[PDB]
Amino acid sequence: MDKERLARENHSEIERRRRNKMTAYITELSDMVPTCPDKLTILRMAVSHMKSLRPSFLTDQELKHLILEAADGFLFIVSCETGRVVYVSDSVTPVLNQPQSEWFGSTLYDQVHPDDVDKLREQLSTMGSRRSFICRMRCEPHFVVVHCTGYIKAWPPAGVSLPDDDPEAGQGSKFCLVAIGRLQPTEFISRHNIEGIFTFVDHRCVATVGYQPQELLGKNIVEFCHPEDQQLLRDSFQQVVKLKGQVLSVMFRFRSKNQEWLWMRTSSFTFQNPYSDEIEYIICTNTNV
Amino acid sequence: SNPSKRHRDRLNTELDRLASLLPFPQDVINKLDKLSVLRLSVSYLRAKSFFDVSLKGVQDNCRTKFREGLNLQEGEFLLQALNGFVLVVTTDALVFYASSTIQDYLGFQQSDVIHQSVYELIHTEDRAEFQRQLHNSFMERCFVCRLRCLLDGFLAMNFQGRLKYLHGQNKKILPPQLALFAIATPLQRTKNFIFRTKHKLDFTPTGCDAKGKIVLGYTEAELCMRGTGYQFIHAADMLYCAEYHVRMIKTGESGMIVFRLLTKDNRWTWVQSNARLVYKNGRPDYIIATQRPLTDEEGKEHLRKRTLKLPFMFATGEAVLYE
DNA sequence: CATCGGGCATCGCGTGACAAG
DNA sequence: GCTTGTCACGCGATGCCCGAT
Ligand SMILES: c1ccc2c(c1)cc1ccc3cccc4ccc2c1c34
């Protein structure tokens, strides 16, 4: 067509759509104020209501409300040196069923499972300096799997006043972890030590027993086995060591992720160091039946 | 003058009065246009209306001045610990809210995203998926999408959130709609970085250079306390490593071998290595392995071009290591 | 209790200047 | 040197207000 006329009409349509957008926003305004007339009165009443309402778009409490409504969790600020709990939000009570008194004056190592203590240290010593991990927190003592994700921040934080007679005045920590904690027919191969501890897990295990490799890695296989089959499995692992190179098949029951018993056939043999002929680990192929 | 100009001037005066009241820094307000001024006014009003219903400290037992100061920024502390950004989206796919940190992940200004269509930020191949997440009827949601990134260009991000009623929107009187309150997070020097490691005849490491400690993450002691090197090897590469160890025992040199090593992060790193036998008085004494780390693409290429077909060659998994 | 013409105010349309990118 | 968009302006068609019928 004609370039000039086409451009003119496109421009006229742009301006018309702009006008429509403006009138629509004015109607939203009249819908959004106490009592609502023409455009000027709607604008004046909008000015008045915004004046009465009022730099961040949301207040701190509104932002916290949005985040906690989106994905739960509670904030905690601990020191990197000792793990000393500097701060913890009230959202710990709906998450861990624990008052703020339990965490304050405490140390994150005291709040997690002992088996994870060492792991915690690995995440505290020394993109940004993000951190993310999974541990077990207290609530007989009951524990819950908690996914934590946070960051390393220099201490003290700017803006926050620190009086002379305040508990934090003598601590002198340089770095802190600021994090949120939140609650949360095939086969597969694996490698164990000579005691049955999963040291390598194929990713197919999810499709086989419902567990992720982290839920298996580190645990003994016998813990997933049926008590009437546990000694059979133990004797299989004991005899596969005496017969290096030879294969050993054993059927047993495996507690799946849904706490359901599956029947598994495991074929186990041993890997020999090609120089010293020593047993490095036990290779198992675990198949569904 | 004339009446048209006077009406337009009254309109522009009221628009400037609205603009000066917006909760944004002055440098942000001065660069705004009338249309986005009205849009942000509406957005602030709708947000305040929702919070005037859904919303409303430190347990008095544990109240100190410094703890109160921290509690006053609790929200920003959470937003920084998010490692992503907040996104509240209506049934109309409008962005009810997006936190400022979206700029740190996508490049978009918070002021330009609010009250706009969310599909302007979503990839065309994923929008449909998003829509199915917006609408046998439980509430929690978790999925993956790809959003425009001006720092790149797209970024794949995991969205974890919930469907909750967005109260106080005065639609017409309609009942409140179901908005998605979600948190969006991302997903999870090789040019001549050659490092050498010394091993016993059974491949038990004994020594390692600086670049090796940088690549693998072990202190020189931590490397030797975990047994032989076969504890560090991916199960898909154990038989190739054993074969090349036999080759080095036979001929003194292993030849180039590509395989995966377990780091201190319990991660895998592709290495292209060469093990040589060192002799004392005509007998074997120790091993010197020279490794150059590889990218994932190069490693999988060498794996799919493997000459030897061995068991477990294509398996993938995770491992742990103890002393 | 209206109905009717004044003069200004509201409001939607198209167009041209101007600038960010 | 082109594209998309912001803003002002001129311009009538109605709107509201209100003496005056
Ligand atoms: C840290 C730990 C282990 C190994 C390593 C570094 C480097 C190796 C380089 C070649 C190589 C060839 C055949 C078998 C091996 C077994 C273990 C290792 C290596 C092997």
XYZ file of C-alpha atoms in Angstrom, chain A:
289
model
C 0.000 0.000 0.000
C 0.991 3.646 0.360
C 3.789 3.905 2.925
C 2.676 7.357 4.096
C -0.995 6.467 4.590
C -0.141 3.109 6.178
C 2.210 4.768 8.670
C -0.359 7.486 9.400
C -3.097 4.951 10.148
C -0.774 2.800 12.275
C 0.106 5.901 14.302
C -3.561 6.852 14.710
C -4.320 3.334 15.957
C -1.413 3.533 18.418
C -2.757 6.785 19.869
C -6.318 5.416 20.002
C -5.177 2.318 21.906
C -3.246 4.596 24.280
C -6.424 6.589 24.962
C -8.373 3.383 25.578
C -5.699 2.187 28.020
C -5.884 5.494 29.894
C -9.676 5.395 30.232
C -9.497 1.756 31.364
C -6.962 2.638 34.064
C -9.184 5.531 35.171
C -12.116 3.124 35.477
C -9.944 0.781 37.557
C -9.125 3.786 39.749
C -12.810 4.584 40.288
C -13.309 0.915 41.170
C -10.393 1.054 43.625
C -11.221 4.067 45.837
C -13.777 4.390 48.687
C -16.646 6.218 46.955
C -16.735 6.311 43.149
C -18.244 10.572 38.072
C -16.017 12.136 35.401
C -12.280 11.650 34.896
C -11.116 14.705 36.852
C -13.103 13.846 39.987
C -11.916 10.231 39.820
C -8.323 11.463 39.578
C -8.751 13.855 42.515
C -10.277 11.128 44.691
C -7.456 8.783 43.659
C -4.907 11.412 44.701
C -6.684 11.743 48.052
C -6.813 7.989 48.691
C -3.153 7.497 47.760
C -2.272 10.406 50.054
C -4.122 8.755 52.941
C -2.415 5.432 52.141
C 1.218 6.575 51.910
C 11.013 3.897 49.040
C 9.672 0.381 48.475
C 6.500 -0.530 46.602
C 5.468 -2.894 49.404
C 6.163 -2.518 53.093
C 8.477 -5.050 54.724
C 5.552 -6.908 56.315
C 3.662 -7.018 53.003
C 6.678 -8.488 51.196
C 7.219 -11.057 53.951
C 3.513 -11.904 53.747
C 3.750 -12.466 49.987
C 6.829 -14.693 50.255
C 5.468 -16.777 53.139
C 2.106 -17.113 51.386
C 3.931 -18.249 48.249
C 6.164 -20.967 49.690
C 6.064 -21.119 53.529
C 9.425 -21.299 55.308
C 11.088 -19.389 58.115
C 14.122 -17.113 58.100
C 17.161 -17.652 60.296
C 20.447 -15.765 60.584
C 23.329 -17.712 62.144
C 27.019 -16.946 62.618
C 29.499 -18.766 60.390
C 32.074 -19.268 63.151
C 30.079 -20.964 65.919
C 26.685 -21.456 64.285
C 25.240 -19.114 66.919
C 21.624 -18.222 66.157
C 21.604 -14.450 65.734
C 17.997 -14.239 64.568
C 14.997 -16.416 63.755
C 11.562 -15.414 62.501
C 8.306 -16.296 64.234
C 7.477 -18.457 61.184
C 9.547 -21.146 62.890
C 6.546 -21.950 65.099
C 4.288 -22.946 62.151
C 7.202 -24.709 60.418
C 9.007 -26.651 63.158
C 6.400 -26.404 65.952
C 9.108 -24.648 67.974
C 8.952 -21.297 69.797
C 11.449 -18.549 69.099
C 12.902 -19.227 72.566
C 14.301 -22.586 71.430
C 16.472 -21.084 68.676
C 17.519 -17.774 70.252
C 20.681 -18.089 72.323
C 21.288 -21.477 70.646
C 23.508 -22.786 67.777
C 22.240 -24.320 64.479
C 24.321 -27.434 65.187
C 22.246 -27.943 68.344
C 19.043 -27.695 66.276
C 19.851 -30.253 63.569
C 20.326 -34.003 63.650
C 23.778 -35.035 64.948
C 24.492 -37.025 61.767
C 24.240 -33.763 59.786
C 26.430 -31.646 62.107
C 29.573 -32.205 60.034
C 27.627 -31.436 56.851
C 26.544 -28.137 58.419
C 30.172 -27.153 59.013
C 30.959 -27.709 55.329
C 28.224 -25.184 54.474
C 29.387 -22.540 56.977
C 33.180 -22.308 56.678
C 34.604 -19.431 54.624
C 26.900 -15.585 41.496
C 27.293 -14.496 45.085
C 28.165 -16.678 48.055
C 24.905 -18.604 47.997
C 24.281 -21.730 50.068
C 21.680 -24.472 49.740
C 21.386 -27.841 51.453
C 19.074 -30.337 53.160
C 19.208 -31.297 56.836
C 17.004 -32.641 59.638
C 15.654 -30.261 62.280
C 14.130 -30.910 65.698
C 10.465 -30.368 66.595
C 11.017 -38.405 72.267
C 12.778 -36.003 69.878
C 11.108 -35.830 66.440
C 12.992 -34.544 63.355
C 11.788 -33.239 59.967
C 13.631 -32.909 56.662
C 14.228 -29.197 56.013
C 15.542 -27.664 52.788
C 17.583 -24.527 53.515
C 18.676 -21.927 51.023
C 20.454 -18.725 51.877
C 23.542 -16.609 51.441
C 26.693 -15.400 53.171
C 26.446 -11.797 54.379
C 28.984 -9.556 56.087
C 28.094 -8.665 59.693
C 26.808 -6.368 61.086
C 24.145 -5.377 58.548
C 24.057 -1.737 57.533
C 21.154 0.312 58.841
C 20.512 -1.834 61.906
C 21.586 -0.017 65.060
C 23.683 -1.983 67.563
C 23.641 -0.448 71.068
C 26.492 -0.716 73.547
C 24.528 -2.813 76.073
C 23.104 -5.296 73.502
C 23.985 -9.026 73.464
C 25.379 -8.779 69.915
C 27.849 -6.038 70.922
C 30.420 -8.531 72.206
C 30.122 -11.319 69.648
C 31.980 -9.620 66.802
C 31.105 -12.113 64.072
C 32.297 -11.143 60.595
C 30.123 -13.362 58.373
C 26.643 -14.815 58.797
C 24.427 -17.275 56.959
C 21.019 -15.727 56.210
C 18.674 -18.469 55.025
C 15.108 -19.723 54.680
C 14.178 -23.212 55.862
C 11.186 -25.028 54.375
C 9.579 -28.402 55.045
C 9.528 -30.995 52.263
C 9.324 -53.059 35.722
C 13.000 -51.768 35.567
C 16.311 -52.068 37.459
C 19.226 -49.980 38.730
C 22.899 -50.540 39.526
C 24.739 -49.546 42.687
C 28.060 -49.790 44.509
C 28.334 -50.571 48.223
C 31.200 -51.171 50.590
C 31.662 -54.590 52.203
C 29.159 -53.586 54.909
C 26.247 -52.707 52.602
C 26.491 -48.900 52.557
C 25.309 -47.373 49.277
C 28.317 -45.419 47.994
C 27.033 -45.084 44.414
C 23.426 -45.195 43.195
C 22.162 -45.240 39.616
C 19.643 -42.515 38.822
C 17.137 -45.177 37.706
C 16.442 -46.031 41.364
C 13.591 -43.503 41.390
C 11.784 -45.528 38.725
C 12.583 -48.737 40.643
C 12.073 -48.072 44.370
C 10.823 -44.468 44.457
C 13.868 -43.081 46.285
C 16.240 -40.376 45.123
C 19.957 -41.272 45.262
C 20.459 -38.977 48.274
C 17.904 -40.986 50.262
C 19.930 -44.137 49.464
C 23.519 -42.840 49.462
C 25.122 -43.339 52.870
C 22.494 -45.747 54.214
C 22.934 -49.489 54.435
C 20.875 -51.567 52.035
C 19.816 -53.933 54.834
C 17.811 -51.105 56.419
C 15.476 -51.215 53.397
C 15.120 -55.012 53.654
C 12.474 -57.202 55.313
C 13.528 -58.692 58.681
C 12.861 -62.264 57.525
C 15.118 -61.513 54.521
C 17.733 -59.349 56.264
C 19.974 -62.226 57.337
C 19.733 -63.739 53.848
C 20.839 -60.411 52.357
C 23.625 -60.090 54.939
C 24.913 -63.585 54.147
C 24.787 -62.728 50.437
C 27.000 -59.695 51.046
C 29.288 -61.824 53.231
C 29.656 -64.649 50.696
C 30.173 -62.368 47.684
C 33.356 -61.174 49.411
C 34.740 -64.699 49.870
C 34.073 -65.492 46.176
C 35.779 -62.657 44.318
C 34.793 -62.350 40.664
C 31.881 -64.765 41.038
C 28.319 -63.474 40.818
C 25.733 -63.969 43.574
C 21.970 -63.684 43.052
C 19.642 -63.057 45.998
C 15.926 -62.257 46.194
C 14.477 -60.155 49.001
C 11.909 -57.488 49.862
C 12.614 -53.760 49.565
C 10.669 -51.053 51.401
C 9.739 -48.728 48.542
C 9.266 -44.977 48.941
C 5.531 -45.520 49.513
C 6.453 -47.844 52.421
C 5.378 -50.757 50.192
C 7.269 -54.040 49.911
C 8.675 -54.833 46.465
C 10.455 -58.035 45.463
C 14.015 -57.375 44.279
C 16.569 -59.700 42.695
C 20.096 -58.438 43.366
C 23.137 -59.720 41.480
C 26.319 -58.828 43.366
C 29.999 -59.247 42.543
C 33.262 -57.628 43.652
C 35.631 -55.199 41.916
C 39.322 -56.090 42.215
C 42.125 -53.530 42.175
C 44.053 -54.749 39.099
C 47.381 -54.422 40.951
C 46.808 -55.627 44.532
C 43.672 -57.716 43.787
C 42.016 -56.092 46.801
C 38.270 -55.551 47.091
C 37.396 -51.965 46.193
C 33.602 -52.250 46.455
C 30.598 -54.468 45.692
C 28.645 -53.918 42.464
C 24.949 -54.803 42.669
C 22.355 -54.911 39.902
C 18.960 -54.656 41.615
C 16.016 -55.639 39.416
C 12.265 -55.603 39.977
C 10.388 -58.903 40.012
